Design a protein around this ligand. Sequence first.
Ligand code: CNC
Lengths: 335, 623
Amino acid sequence: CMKWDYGKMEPFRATGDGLFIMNEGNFQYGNATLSYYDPETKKVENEIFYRANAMKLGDVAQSMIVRDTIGWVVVNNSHVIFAISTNTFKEVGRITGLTSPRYIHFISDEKAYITQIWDYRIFIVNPKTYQITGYIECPDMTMETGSTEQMVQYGKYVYVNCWSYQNRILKIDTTTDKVVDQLTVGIQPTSLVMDKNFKMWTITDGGYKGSPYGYEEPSLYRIDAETFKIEKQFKFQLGDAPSEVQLNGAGDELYWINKDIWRMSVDEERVPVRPFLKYRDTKYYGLTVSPKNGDVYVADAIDYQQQGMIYRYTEDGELVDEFYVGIIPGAFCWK
Amino acid sequence: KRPMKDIGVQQTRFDSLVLKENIALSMADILTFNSSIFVKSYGRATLSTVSFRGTSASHTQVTWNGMRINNPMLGMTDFSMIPSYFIDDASLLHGTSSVNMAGGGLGGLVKLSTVPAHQEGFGMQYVQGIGSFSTFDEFLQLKYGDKHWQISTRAVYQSSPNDYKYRNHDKKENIYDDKYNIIEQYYPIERNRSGAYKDLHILQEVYYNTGKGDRFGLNAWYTDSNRELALLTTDQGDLMDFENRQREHTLRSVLSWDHTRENWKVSARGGYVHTWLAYDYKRDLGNGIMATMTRSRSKVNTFYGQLDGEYFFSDKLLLTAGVSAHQHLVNSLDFDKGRIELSGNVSLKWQPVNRLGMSLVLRGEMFGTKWAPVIPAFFVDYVLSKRGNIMAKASITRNYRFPTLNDLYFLPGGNPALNNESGFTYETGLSFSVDKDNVYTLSGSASWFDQHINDWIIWLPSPVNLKKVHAYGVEVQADYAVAIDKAWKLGLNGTFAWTPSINEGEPTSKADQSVGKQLPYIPEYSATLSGRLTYRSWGLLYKWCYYSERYTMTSNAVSYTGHLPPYLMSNVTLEKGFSLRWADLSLKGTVNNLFDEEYLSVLSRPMPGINFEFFIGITPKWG
Ligand code: CNC
């Protein structure tokens, strides 16, 4: 007639060139978890962080960056960024005292930018002393609807997009740590990526009818690197929610969900008609492209309250594998 | 024996000493330890969700003095904001019995009311409670009566910081060195953060009785709530300058008129409720500026009217009818529109022979602009044996529940063209009572219910309907009261419920491991047991609650980070009463979490260890 809960550690010895899957988990449940997949032996380990540390990851894991043998897992709803080893999944440190961080971007060995939602500031941290050393103020940004998501750097500048309740991408000068110029796109640019010939690709969300900015046709853009301009814009027609336009290893080929998983090349023209994977009554939430061989992994969240499945497809489009992970697999990172 | 109204009806009745046993108990705590209902609540002064017979919270209707209390936007009631001392009478209508009074009560109905007192002259009562964690409870009663008038006034104030210490098993604090390396990691002993709350409730009653068959009434209930939302277990850092707040101002009023005669009786009733909600989420940055990150306001106004009738053709035949109307004018700042709700019912009760008894209920509804199919209900009752009062019951119905106001009219996702859920139910059960010559009184019941839910409304990337759910099981309850000696009395009340909640929907996608699976946060088994021992002025009370394992995933898969163990809790209360000259003193001390469990009822929600509570009650005596 009693109750109890403890934890026990476990010696992981992961080797090979695996894939890290960040399961977001649900919201105000604290069931976010991390998973590891080995493409050679087709063996997947779930809850690697808790199993190797005897403590929960947090709430709403968002992304992860691998530098050398250290991976930085950013947790949104826990105000923390965990630093773990990519060979043992042991904790090497933590960055705490943030306000719902989204992404991290290392511009030098001694400096790093962190971007938040519900804030008008971009944090600056030292990846060694583990302390905040300043903030960057985005102009015309309010605490009520502040949002900055993804960073791509180009020479001395850093490019960000402003997703939630925003329609702007910002250019930051890393020498003076100031916003130097602005660009305007459609409502809610979700993700930002850079290709091999230096052209940023961003994709704009629709609006999910009712939002204060209202709805607008989801679009795709090809902003140039040196000079902004807008160069070219693509139209995706209403009723769609495209996102996650990340590239491949070579950085010359586009990939976005938009219902049917599409595949576009750089320095090409209007969207093709034949999808990479037409439709098989599945709810695709995220995807990634392997830089080694070119396999395409797509994540299926099912009903957002159970274990999701990832499908592994070759460059041709044939299924090779499928395996279970934590709840709502959100992002991928390569060891 | 039974009244003609109670024919073939399965229900449980909360008597006065259950409700008036402690001033710190809300109706969430009453339902947790005194019924087989599952209550989802991660502590005290926090959101409480009632899952009744394997259904969701939206399928349970709550009526206070005949007026529905569920929030029209959300469709669910927070049971933690209803003090038990503000309720003088509570009943639980199970399944088909809810059709007797309400509409879309697919799970059931909770009937709350206030009863006129019988006080001659003026009297008053004051109760003060002191407990651990710096919690304070106060309750003041004022009343008066002169054989025509009955005026009463109550006030309840509760406040606490909620800074209890718990040992944290989900987080490890690391000890650094001169060069920022982890040397040792330990489980910290933290305190509950952002959990402070302050609640104020005021109730005013005015009752008049002509004595010629006309009785008038008026009740007003005011609520002032100021609660903070606690931090999760897996929340990192010494995060100060972070506040959550849910202010909630609400006024409930009901006007009642009863006109009775020889065989017929007509009751008219009207009411009005006003609600103001405010959610804040701020961060203190810089030096003194406190920026705001989330700000939500909402106002709800509802007007209620009802007219009931009842006619006795004879002692063995009865007719009832009634019309109800609700108008939820919602002006939620930051959509401003609402619904008109109409309900009518006609019922026939017939008692052809001494044993057999039949009842037929026909109900129709119209919410806003859409009518609903007629809801029928048939109840039959038979007496198997007069010796042990063995009685058999059965019922059947087809109930419909309308979508909530957010499922229809909401900013990010507002599908207007949404169907209403339907449910086909049939029940059967037995009962007994073996009262003996003032030695013991044993009574109980056991009922089987089988119920099918169709067109369940669920949000998944937005109403999408679907979610066929099969809910069935067995309910058992029993009461016992024996006098061991001429001064010792023992009472045992126990309930049990096996309630599988299986979803029969077609598998979405291809990897859906959810067909044939228990629904999330619904235990398969539940049990309660309450023991009371009385010796002169001494009283010992024992409360025990059991919940089976609650799954946090629709696939019921085994997970390290989503495991909720079965919930067992034990509470003990010892009370001593003294009789002074100008007042009556009642001293009682409550021990909650007697065995000091380090547990987790809701995922990542820390809960206190063993805690104490001490009450003082004064009741002046005059001429
Ligand atoms: C699709 C989805 C999701 N959402 Co929205 C996204 N994208 N959401 C939506 C969309 C539809 C659902 C809806 N109308 O609310 C969409 C875009 C409209 C919506 C809305 C929002 N979302 C937002 C954000 C960023 C998030 N959302 C997630 C919850 C992100 C979810 C991811 C996740 N990790 O959970 C998500 C992927 C799946 C949620 C779900 O359905 N779960 C299944 C179901 C069982 O959960 P549930 O709890 O019953 O669902 C309710 C809530 O989650 C609620 N909800 C969603 N977002 C919020 C934010 C807040 C503050 C609150 C109180 C509730 C919500 O939506 C449901 C309906 O009430 C989020 C964890 C994803 C992420 N990592 O960025 C994140 C929370 C971030 C944070 N730390 O605050 C928005 C600010 C985006 C925007 N501007 O549109 C906005 C906030 C609402 C507001 N009041 O302004």
